[PDB]
């Protein structure tokens, strides 16, 4: 009637073990699934590279500091240039997949702090304008802030999620905390959420993956200062259709 603290996630040829885990969030209670023939629209037979792309990718490691604001990634964008998944996303026009995001952050029993790990669908990034009216360039964010790639982008104003919506209500999204006194990882399984059965993995980013330190990292002199945060993700039930020449962006 409870959840065990140890867990092991095996998909593809990758395996992730954790010994201080809270639980596994199944976003909106739906598992990732292939597109049913009742909901599909494209007539080309999709390709399903089962184990070559549905596997864990350790992508970026950010160092948690006491004055850190947080970072965010975009799920299809962060994997577009890595492994067999990136190739299929570049060679095919259409794409759909879920994922299992796994954020890892361990620290001693003498550190403290809490991260908010949330998976935000359609995480449209806002630009903060200096009250300028005449539709200046500073009215829209550049491409580096909308599609950060695999390095991610650190928040400018985490209080409003860089989107004008309050951070306090971000818990309405599938989320999980990394409380250093309780757990050292956060797992979120997210199904493919989109108004279309398939979509371009290059233009459209289905989910934003934010990691925001709510309670700042604090420790005393003598403890390890470099406390990293590693983001490992894995596509689930990924399909591709509409083969053509490989397109980078």
């Amino acid at each position: 009637g409870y959840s065990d603290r140890v867990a092991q996630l095996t998909v593809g040829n990758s395996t992730i073990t954790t010994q201080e885990a809270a639980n596994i969030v199944l976003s909106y209670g739906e598992w990732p699934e292939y597109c049913p023939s009742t909901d599909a629209t494209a007539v080309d037979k999709p390709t399903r590279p089962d184990v070559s792309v549905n596997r864990f990718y350790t992508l970026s490691t950010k160092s948690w500091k006491t004055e850190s604001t947080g970072w965010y990634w975009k799920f299809p964008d962060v994997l577009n240039d890595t492994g067999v998944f990136g190739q299929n996303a570049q060679f095919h026009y259409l794409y759909r997949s879920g994922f299992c995001m796994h954020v890892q952050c361990n620290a001693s029993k003498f550190h403290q702090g809490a991260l908010l790990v949330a998976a935000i669908p359609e995480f449209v990034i806002a630009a903060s304008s200096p009250a300028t009216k005449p539709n200046s360039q500073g009215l829209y964010p550049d491409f580096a802030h909308t599609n950060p790639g695999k390095d991610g982008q650190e928040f400018r104003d985490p209080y409003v999620l860089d989107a004008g919506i309050p951070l306090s209500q971000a818990l309405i999204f599938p989320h999980q905390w990394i409380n250093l006194r309780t757990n050292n990882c956060a797992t979120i399984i997210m199904p493919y959420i989109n108004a279309l059965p398939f979509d371009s993995a290059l233009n459209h980013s289905n989910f934003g993956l934010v990691v925001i330190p709510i309670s700042p990292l604090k420790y005393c002199n003598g403890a390890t200062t470099e406390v990293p945060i590693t983001l490992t993700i894995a596509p689930l039930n990924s399909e591709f259709s509409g083969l053509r020449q490989a397109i980078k962006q």
Binding site: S37, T38, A40, T41, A42, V43, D44, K45, P46
Partner: peptide, 12 residues
């Protein structure tokens, strides 16, 4: 028909 020129899926 499309069925005879490419490999199609079942689309209801």
């Amino acid at each position: 028909s499309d069925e005879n020129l490419i490999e199609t899926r079942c689309v209801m």
